[PDB]
């Protein structure tokens, strides 16, 4: 009653406050910048070892090794240069949504419908990789796992929550809960001091790991958002949703800076990532291909049409030398 | 020239052989998605033979893995992409919900939602109607018109249940791609596993017949 109306009034006043600062005229800021033109990339290598649908991939910080997870029940670590398979970790629950690579290269993480974030140790004696830990406590389903350090990992679950754990103790050290729908995507800032999460509410929330409260909330999407990626500078992020629309938001402006959509695409976004310089925005649609947008100009600059099914995962190397796209076609391509 | 890179290549080939062998072994295992009403008759068919609980058994040289949905309570469309390509969906139904405090409308709405999905436009669904012991005497006492205003006929298992089956099997909108066929659960003569085997056999026959051409 009174409290709900007060909350509505606060929402209206913050909306007006952000609308007052909306002096973009962005049709006049990007016209001076010379367009990138048209880029062309080809599949330098094709990694063919999965015999089911692959769901996630993640690059290592060395920009050579990459982990890929598939429905067949095994996640395999690829040497991207030589197409070799370094490890073939057989996981317990065949249904997996996400995989992660530790920045140090020592551990990998996996999870999915089992509601368990399994952490495997690669660099060990005795030879084979072993399941180091099994983080448990989520009541939904694991959707995105990201590594902060070798000891801190942030996960997102389908029960409208995110958590920050300690791997050594295997307990939720911090819990973030402000969403009203299944949280589907999660992205860490380059400084790893804060992250952003997107859920079915068509709202992306910005959390700081140290505090635990949603610093900002961004709206504008009409449907569920499936992908979040941080801008390389850390002061912006991009969201791809099910309505064929990418939206670039800026943390300081607290508004929708840019929108990327075309009249001829109606299918949904599955993954979004930036290039090293942030000029290119890679979007993996459900049209069995990927698009490359000019981030500063919102003009479609390229198409990565090389997959025989929908592209489910998309990643860019830390040095920005290659883009690995994995699809339900059971192969992942590496474009350059 | 490739001093110990040759050993890395050999290791890759060896684990690739292991991958191929494991996948070939997995291709002989059939995955069955499971749905059903909440704690209505899900305890009956399971007697014939966290996030997700997978039940594994084997019947006539075929490994059946069954994944139920009663362990997860969330939005159905957000996990429906994970089950694309599953062999078949077993959707249990209880006939005691026609006069219950109502459930038939939700069940048929769920059937409509699941039979027209973006990913489930081709998967086949088996369905078993259970709790016939109650149905023996609840039909004469309470006519079936409570949930079927447009239906009128004899209050007997021969015709009323036939009408319910016809309505349920007509609830699908793409009827020429996915086959919807039914068996009757029996407390004695536990042949329901045999019917599941025959249904998945027919599903595989049609799948590879389509895949080979023609």
């Amino acid at each position, epitope marked *: 009653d009174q409290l709900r109306q007060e909350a509505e009034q606060l929402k209206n006043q913050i909306r007006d406050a952000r609308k007052a600062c909306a002096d973009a005229t962005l049709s006049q800021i990007t016209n001076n910048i010379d367009p990138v033109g048209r880029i062309q990339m080809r599949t330098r290598r094709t990694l063919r070892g999965h015999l089911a649908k692959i769901y996630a991939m993640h690059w290592g910080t060395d920009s050579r090794l990459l982990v890929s997870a598939s429905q067949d029940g095994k996640l395999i670590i690829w040497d991207s240069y030589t197409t070799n398979k370094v490890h073939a970790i057989p996981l317990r629950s065949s249904w997996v949504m996400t995989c992660a690579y530790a920045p140090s290269g020592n551990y990998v993480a996996c999870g999915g419908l089992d509601n368990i974030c399994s952490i495997y140790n690669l660099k060990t004696r005795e*030879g084979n990789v072993r399941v180091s830990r099994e983080l448990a406590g989520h009541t939904g389903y694991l959707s995105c796992c990201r590594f902060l350090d070798d000891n801190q990992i942030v996960t997102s679950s389908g029960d409208t929550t995110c958590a920050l754990w300690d791997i050594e103790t295997g307990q939720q050290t911090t819990t973030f809960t402000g969403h009203t729908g299944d949280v589907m995507s999660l992205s860490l800032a380059p400084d790893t001091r804060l992250f952003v999460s997107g859920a079915c509410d068509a709202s992306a929330k910005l959390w700081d790991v140290r505090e635990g409260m949603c610093r900002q909330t961004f709206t504008g999407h009409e449907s569920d958002i499936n992908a979040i990626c941080f801008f390389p500078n850390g002061n912006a992020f991009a969201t791809g949703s099910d309505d064929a629309t990418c939206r670039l938001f800026d943390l300081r402006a607290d508004q929708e800076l840019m929108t990327y959509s075309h009249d001829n695409i109606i299918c949904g976004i599955t993954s979004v990532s930036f290039s090293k310089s942030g000029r290119l925005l890679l979007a993996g649609y459900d049209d069995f291909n990927c698009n490359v947008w000019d981030a500063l100009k919102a003009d479609r600059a390229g198409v990565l049409a090389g997959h025989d099914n929908r592209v489910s995962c998309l990643g860019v190397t830390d040095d920005g030398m290659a883009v690995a796209t994995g699809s339900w076609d059971s192969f992942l391509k590496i474009w350059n | 020239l490739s001093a110990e890179d040759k050993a*890395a290549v050999e290791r890759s080939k060896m684990i690739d052989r292991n991958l191929r062998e494991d996948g070939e072994k997995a291709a002989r295992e059939v995955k069955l998605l499971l749905l059903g009403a909440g704690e209505s008759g899900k305890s009956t068919i399971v007697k014939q033979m966290t996030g997700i609980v997978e039940t594994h058994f084997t019947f006539k040289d075929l490994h059946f893995k069954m994944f139920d949905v009663g362990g997860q309570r969330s939005e159905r469309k957000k996990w429906i992409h994970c089950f694309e390509g599953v062999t078949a969906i077993i959707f249990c139904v209880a006939l005691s919900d026609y006069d219950l405090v109502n459930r038939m409308h939700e069940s048929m709405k769920l059937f409509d939602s699941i039979c027209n999905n973006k990913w489930f436009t081709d998967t086949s669904i088996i369905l078993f109607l259970n709790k016939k012991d109650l149905f023996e005497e609840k039909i004469k006492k309470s006519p079936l018109t409570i949930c079927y205003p447009e239906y009128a006929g004899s209050n007997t298992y021969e015709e009323a249940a036939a009408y319910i089956q016809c309505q349920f099997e007509d609830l699908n909108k793409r009827k020429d791609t996915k086959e919807i066929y039914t068996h009757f659960t029996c407390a004695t003569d536990t042949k329901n596993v045999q019917f599941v085997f025959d249904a998945v056999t027919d599903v595989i026959i049609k799948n590879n017949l389509k895949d080979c051409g023609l």
Partner: single-chain antibody
Amino acid sequence: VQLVESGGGLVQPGGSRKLSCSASGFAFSSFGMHWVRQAPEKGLEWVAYISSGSGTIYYADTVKGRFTISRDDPKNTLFLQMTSLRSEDTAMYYCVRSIYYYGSSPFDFWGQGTTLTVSSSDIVMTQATSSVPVTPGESVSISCRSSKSLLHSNGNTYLYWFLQRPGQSPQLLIYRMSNLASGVPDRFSGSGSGTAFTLTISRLEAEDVGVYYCMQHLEYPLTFGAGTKLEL
């Protein structure tokens, strides 16, 4: 991790003998296994190698034909059958585990070895210095000379530094000329270019007294240096 050698002893020349290596504590079937021997008063000499899955077998020229290396993965054992033994085969044999993928650490664990006494264009890893005076707390540099450039087109400089303490099995100090092995302290460091390598020790302590060997892995057969001995 544990590797135990057995089957040594006294053998008449021209006879045959079987050496067995029992493995414990690691996934034996995922490791290549080397037999490396050391003469009674000389350096290390590589004998034979068998890969994972027995898909590749290599021998040394002085032992080819007379020796046969095999493995039993289910029993976690490695076998070296030796025929027509000569006085030149009188040595202590070590069973060495190795594993090859992007970023692995081959030759990272050696067995205790067994003694066998018989009564009576390979890359030359030339070694210059046989001994240096040693004072604890100082820094010592050791040099290794290679007849061929160990740098490869993939950027890896396949040079390995091992240390053998008095009366002890050798351990891996450095692999590929710039990587410290597992458990070794940070005092040890390695550097160099093709055909010129250096191992440097800062703040020398005790237990570092021993023989330092440089080995190449650019191509079979693998060859060791003569050996540099540090004495107080």
